[PDB]
Design a protein around this nucleic acid. Sequence first.
RNA 1: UCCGCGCCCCGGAGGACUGAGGGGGAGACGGGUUCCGCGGCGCCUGCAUCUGGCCGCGGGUGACUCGGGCCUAAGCGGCGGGUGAAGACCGGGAAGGGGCGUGCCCGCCCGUCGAACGGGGAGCCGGCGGAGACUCCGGCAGGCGCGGCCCCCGCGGAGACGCCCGCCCCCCGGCGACGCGCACGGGGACCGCGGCGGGCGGCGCCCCGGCCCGCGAACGCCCCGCAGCCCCCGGACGCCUUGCGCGGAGAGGGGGGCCCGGGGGCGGACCGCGCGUCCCCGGCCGCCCCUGAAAAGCCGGGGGGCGCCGGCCGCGCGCCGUACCGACCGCAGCAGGACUCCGGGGUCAGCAGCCUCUAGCGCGGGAGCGAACGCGGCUCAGGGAAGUCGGCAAGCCGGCUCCGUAACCUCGGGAAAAGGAGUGGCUCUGACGGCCCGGGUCAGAACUGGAACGGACGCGGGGAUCCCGACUGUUUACUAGAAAC
Lengths: 72, 103, 96, 49, 50, 91
Amino acid sequence: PNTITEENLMKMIADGRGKKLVVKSCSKGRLQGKVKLKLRTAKYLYTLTVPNADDAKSIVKGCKDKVEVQYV
Amino acid sequence: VKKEQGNIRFAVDCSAGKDLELNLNEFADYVRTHFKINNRKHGVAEKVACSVEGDSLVIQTTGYEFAKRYVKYLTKRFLYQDYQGVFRVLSTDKETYTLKPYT
Amino acid sequence: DCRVTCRFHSTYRTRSKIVRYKRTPGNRLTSLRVKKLPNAPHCAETGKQIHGIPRVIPQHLTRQQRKVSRPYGGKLCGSALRAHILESFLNEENQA
Amino acid sequence: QRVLRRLLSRYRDDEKIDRHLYETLYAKAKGNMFKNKRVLLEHIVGMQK
Amino acid sequence: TANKTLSRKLRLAKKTKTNKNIPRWVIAKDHLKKTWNYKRHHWRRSHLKL
Amino acid sequence: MAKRTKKVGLTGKYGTRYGRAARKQLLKIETSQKAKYTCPFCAKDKVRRTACGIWTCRSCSKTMAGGAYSLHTEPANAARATIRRLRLARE
RNA sequence: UCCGCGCCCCGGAGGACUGAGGGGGAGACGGGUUCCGCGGCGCCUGCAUCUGGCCGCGGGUGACUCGGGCCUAAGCGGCGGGUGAAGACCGGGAAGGGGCGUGCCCGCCCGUCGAACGGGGAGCCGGCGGAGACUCCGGCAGGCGCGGCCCCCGCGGAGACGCCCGCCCCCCGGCGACGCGCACGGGGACCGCGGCGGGCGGCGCCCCGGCCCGCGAACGCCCCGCAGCCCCCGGACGCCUUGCGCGGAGAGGGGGGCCCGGGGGCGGACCGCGCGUCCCCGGCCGCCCCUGAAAAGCCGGGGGGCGCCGGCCGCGCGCCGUACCGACCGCAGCAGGACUCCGGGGUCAGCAGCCUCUAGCGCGGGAGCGAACGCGGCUCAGGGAAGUCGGCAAGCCGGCUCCGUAACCUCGGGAAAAGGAGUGGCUCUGACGGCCCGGGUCAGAACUGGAACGGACGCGGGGAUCCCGACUGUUUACUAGAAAC
């Protein structure tokens, strides 16, 4: 897997390139509360850790609705 | 921080309910008399004090850090004095141990 | 015990059968083969390693990474190609 | 050898010892002249004074 | 042996399926009186392909 | 120093075995093979014997044919001179 | 061994054992279903059996990545033909192909033989079954082809080189591709030591001192990576190793690049510290009258010729092998012989011996008695080879440190010569690094003990000669290991 180049590549890939899903993981491991967005694509699963809960709100609304968001 | 340490609070909830007796005030004497900073028990009561809060017993410190294993050892010894059969000293969250009765 | 048994089809420990050991998320020792380093292109003249070419199979190296940016880049090194260019200019000048 | 060389390289880089002196002391240490770093340190104080 | 050959495996396989007892109904139909196969082999003593 | 007093200097390895005559001949032959002869082109005494008949300058990296235990054999050196004098005469 | 209902099977509880060059866990070969589950004992299990590798029944081996296949090695076949009564043997001199195109070029001349250890394009983690797993299933990755669609033919640096990657022929190269070693350094795993969190056990007395558990793969990016090599300025007795090595054919110094089976971060998805052990890897140095395979494939570079190349998205990956082996081979369930791979703790110089953790496990049967005699093992007063063909056999010696070492010699040896002294436990005191933090080795003391300490274990007796053969080697598988070769 690879980390995505943050939001800039993330939005473009979700909007145009094939993204099967947006597994959204919230505070996994309880080390920090930062949300992690994992997005499976034909080539690789791309993962971005958004620093805030409100940052996580932004991507789920602001993307092509063809990508499906399942929470954790 | 091996030199600084800090003030810390460890507690054991007896949970006997006095159903299995458990003096608690005497329990705090056992911890109070046998607590040793190093191998030496010299000047233990300046850095550490033990007191009974309701059902539970609290071991608080003012400049000392010790293993929560030690409270498990002291408790176990106090039970070997009398109620050998019961109590499993299970952890119930950080800072707190419980004298869970046996099966 | 941490004995790992064998990963390859046959136990024989030839050059291609060296295995590093690492732990797994499941707390087990795993045999991972240590693939042999395929070397890098060597200068025809001088027999020294040509710089810029990683020591991997050229098949998977990509064209730009498997090609130095100089005339006679893969065959001859920078100091060797200076010698060829100098000899050719001077030798040609002598005939002229 | 490493210990004596490290004390000699650090002193060369602190300009305590001139390059020509550094070489003599380095070769003397290859020849077993100084057993401890304390022995070399004194030969170094004596050398520069 | 775990690295066998299909042709060798096929001939060894026939031997495994052939090493079987006379069906009881066959003994009854033909009135055999000799119910032992005598061509039955055992992996401990018999060496096939030897 | 002076760990070995006699010519057993390179022949210490052979030990009591092999006899004095053998070792005496080896003391001359092996001393020369191990030694660093001068490079004709490098001008440094860094030529060493890679293999019998092959001597390589450790500075130039040039490999030069030569004798088995010495870069220059006396018969070859004579012929080198004879060929030079004969060529310059034929010129 | 006891108990359970109890069989030698099984379960619990004890007491052992194999002792990490395993009576462990696995493979190559060979056997060919022995593997597994259920039922049974008629055989077999050399006593027994309710057991079983035995018997009946029903099942069990899943691969784009691992291996075969593939390519070559020693070799082996094949060749217009040559020969021989032939069978058969022998073999370059003989009009021996290919590409695109439908024409033109290019071109002397065979291996789709031979390796489940060599070369090779690419796989990991978790989970699931009575019998399997790099194969299944879930995750995640890589390799190579194919189709659709899009994109379009170089830039940067002073250089070393950096990046946003064209193909085909002819030539030049490269990778595949390689000895042995002694040290030395670097990683990985293993190991140990603490801390802390979580469980335990024992507890007559002590016990924060005993035990167990605490995990992080492939592959993506991004950054560091010693040594090595190279570039720029510049013009030197400097730079450095454990050993070295190096420099006006350019050192040092100040910058840069490159390669480094590695390490870190982010993804995938507990925190420190230390000595060892193993495995790889690096830079050298040594060694040879010893110089340490090949090919398939892959990839550059020059010249030409001619247009590529990428991205995303789908799709595809066929044939074979895959159970198990205390089961192979010697007529046996034959103190017989079988090749590998992984290798913990303590005592130790040790991978030695001796006990142990893990894991395996209790072996062609049991009870008694404690004759002779055997077979292994101990001890023996005083003497000590007087025994015997011969000191055969046994006994002595031995580890470490420190003294002290003769004739003789091919000056290397002799030599551990001979011949001695010490050695335990406790309580200290010096040495030795890095920058208050580590090592546990080497000295020097006291003090103590029935006049003891390599307290088991491991582990030369020594000298003086004579004859043969210089030596290390090799030798009549199975009565000669020699002075023979």
